[PDB]
From a paper:
PHD homologues exist in other types of eukaryotes and prokaryotes where they act on non HIF substrates. The respective prolyl-hydroxylases (DdPhyA and TgPhyA) catalyze prolyl-hydroxylation of S-phase kinase-associated protein 1 (Skp1), a reaction enabling adaptation to different dioxygen availability. In the cellular slime mold Dictyostelium discoideum, the human parasite Toxoplasma gondii and the crop pathogen Pythium ultimum, PHD-type 2OG oxygenases catalyze the hydroxylation of a prolyl residue in the S-phase kinase-associated protein (Skp1). This enables Skp1 glycosylation in a manner proposed to regulate protein degradation via effects on the SCF class of E3-ubiquitin ligase of which Skp1 is an essential subunit; however, glycosylation independent roles of Skp1 prolyl hydroxylation are also manifested.
Author numbering: 58 to 109, 113 to 132, 143 to 232, 245 to 284
The structure:
């Protein structure tokens, strides 16, 4: 079923701060197309190094190649399909939590190569571009086919929601967690490419 939030799951998200949904699409043919289209974006020089050699601005902080996808004759049709599915989750957030009132979404396609990592951080921030907080909910969809237990690249999610747990970035896995509260980091990658599609709900 495509409804994510029932009595228990909502309580887990509010208490534990995260929620893991495996076999989100459960469509192998589509998963492979999302992988291919995501990989082609990198091959076609459509990504950018997030950490860019200026001081404290290099691959020490984060070493992935990212692209910001603007969302509502296309090369990323199947990626857009996933993003639409993720948009339905946002709709469910608004319908189940009365005062959530989503403002907008922000999407990032990220590719890590061998040896890539992302130091501890939280996704939420406050900048002059908006009066209020940015990024309340984080939704990460992994597309790494045939990931084994030694390839690294796991997401280390620190369970401290006002100890950690290593989440394997296996294909078709959807990770949801509260952006302002859960600290996390990407452990070093021993395989390539590590593909992850994130949609933040503001
Ligand atoms: O890709 C992941 O698993 C984790 N990504 C992030 O934390 C990020 O882009 O801010
Ligand atoms: Ni279901
Ligand atoms: Ni993050």
């Amino acid at each position: 079923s495509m409804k994510i939030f029932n009595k228990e799951s909502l309580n887990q998200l509010e208490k534990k701060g995260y929620l893991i949904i495996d076999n989100f699409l459960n469509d192998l043919n589509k998963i492979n197309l999302i992988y291919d289209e995501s990989y082609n974006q990198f091959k076609e020089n459509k990504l950018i190094e997030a950490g860019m050699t200026d001081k404290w601005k290099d691959k020490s902080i984060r070493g992935d190649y990212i692209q910001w996808i603007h969302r509502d004759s296309s090369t990323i049709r199947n990626i857009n399909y996933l993003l639409d599915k993720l948009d339905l989750i946002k709709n469910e957030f608004d319908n189940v939590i009365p005062n959530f009132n989503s403002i907008k979404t922000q999407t990032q396609l990220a590719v890590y190569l061998n040896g890539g990592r992302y130091i501890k951080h939280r996704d939420s921030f406050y900048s002059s571009e908006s009066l209020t907080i940015s990024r309340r909910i984080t939704m990460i969809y992994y597309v790494n086919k045939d990931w084994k237990k030694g390839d690294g690249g796991e997401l280390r999610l620190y369970t401290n929601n006002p100890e950690f747990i290593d989440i394997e970035p296996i294909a078709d896995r959807l990770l949801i967690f509260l952006s302002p509260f859960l600290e996390h980091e990407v452990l070093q990658c021993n395989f390539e490419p590590r593909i992850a599609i994130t949609t933040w709900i503001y």
